[PDB]
């Protein structure tokens, strides 16, 4: 019996978990990191606990941006390489309250040639890894920042962020490419526009910023439909991510994909188009499971 | 004789020219094609009034004044294209008081590799003779950086890389604004810059990871804003060259000022010779060869 919270930058999810593992209650809102920093983390939380009649001494495990510098209380990082089990033990307690409330830290790769950082995904990893062996895994965690993580023996060995989602959104809205992709809201992951682009760039990463301009040139000279231009932009950026993810990885078979929604489908299509097997793990199921593994290790029954 | 106008996306430049060949006056500002579609004559009349231009001095204009989202759509001549075709394909802007033309751009129509250039073809009209003869490879940096295979007053093909526009939007609208924002500049020579260019030119695949690292670098160690900016610029540029190079010794850079330095710096570090050429000297020249061609002047039969 604990609450578990995924505190994101623009949203908030909470689950009350009973003694037997079952979800007894669930709450979900827009009060993410940026709202809570104006109006108060503790108050937003006390709101949801009251709304579902939590006991006053129900303990609470949190992951994500509630633990960033701009959040409720800095949770910091654990340096990789690091056993997945270190996470729960290095959680930060909220100091002047009558409830055990703890926030899990991010992971940091301090290497000077490859500095890298994650906050949130580590907890999804904790939930995902329970479904896999203790053997070797290359794990893809897509988003505004896709994380590619090397798991072995239940340790995170290292990881690489690729800013593909953030790049997509800036290129689509703030550059000339917006005149080619604005008219379209969606595209079909299954379309050739998409997987052709993933292949052009995966095979020719060096040309990336020529290929991006080609989406605009293509439109001007040949009337590329907005949906296909959107796909093309999308595919280019994700194919370049894949190229980087695999740049001397030996042979890799062999990828586990932690994702959900249309995002998860886009990536799976992308990865499978480049000849990789995919093992899907549902991103939301994995946070809860990650948050539950930590709770069971800090408050054992 | 003529007004020459180079009307870019973000900048306006004018030169008044005499039958002698000399510049007589000049105007600069930052009203480019995007600002101009706010106000399309008025900007042109203002600068003309300013410099005391004859009311019927004709006007030759290259650049984005000729795009769809501009003054009037000029065309494109498709590649390979003889540079000498350009002036003949110019497009009038109706005016009873003056003969105003805009130069077309070039288009590479290949369905793989579609590509487009509006203005750099006039810097190439300008510079073809000077550069020399036979095959050249010319790099033309800017918001959109052009790489052009030139031979005998002929563009054979070319490649845009959108490195400048990427630098800007990445610097202003992504998380990296936190890493670079409160710097405005960085010294081309700084090792932060050529390291970025080299690790990226060597590992194109990792580009969008490398970009994230400037911010993770700033979070974990405390990178100085100029070194971050440099890393940023360097990464983008290293990537361009990787792509441009996808043996040449062996390149001719056309550019001016800050960015010109930055690229020679970046290009030499990758082991290339850089025969440089001033950017504005090549445009004024390209607009001159067009002007002489449609409004040839009355010669003195006894001279040459």
Curated annotation (Swiss-Prot), chain A:
> Which branch of life, at top level?
Bacteria
Q: What happens when the gene is disrupted?
A: Cells lacking this gene fail to grow on galactose as sole carbon source.
Which major enzyme category is it?
A: transferase
A molecular function (GO) term: 2-dehydro-3-deoxygalactonokinase activity
Sorted keywords for this record are:
ATP-binding, Kinase, Nucleotide-binding, Transferase
Q: Which reaction does it catalyse?
A: 2-dehydro-3-deoxy-D-galactonate + ATP = 2-dehydro-3-deoxy-6-phospho-D-galactonate + ADP + H(+)
CDD domains in UniProt? ASKHA_NBD_KDGal-kinase
Q: Which InterPro entries does the record cross-reference, listed alphabetically?
A: ATPase_NBD (IPR043129), DGOK (IPR007729), DGOK_C (IPR042257), DGOK_N (IPR042258)
Its pathway is: Carbohydrate acid metabolism; D-galactonate degradation; D-glyceraldehyde 3-phosphate and pyruvate from D-galactonate: step 2/3
EC number(s) on record? 2.7.1.58
GO biological process entries: D-galactonate catabolic process
Q: Which family does it belong to?
A: Belongs to the DgoK family.
Q: What does this protein do?
A: Involved in the degradation of galactose via the DeLey-Doudoroff pathway.
UniProt protein name? Probable 2-dehydro-3-deoxygalactonokinase DgoK1
Its source organism is Rhizobium meliloti (strain 1021)
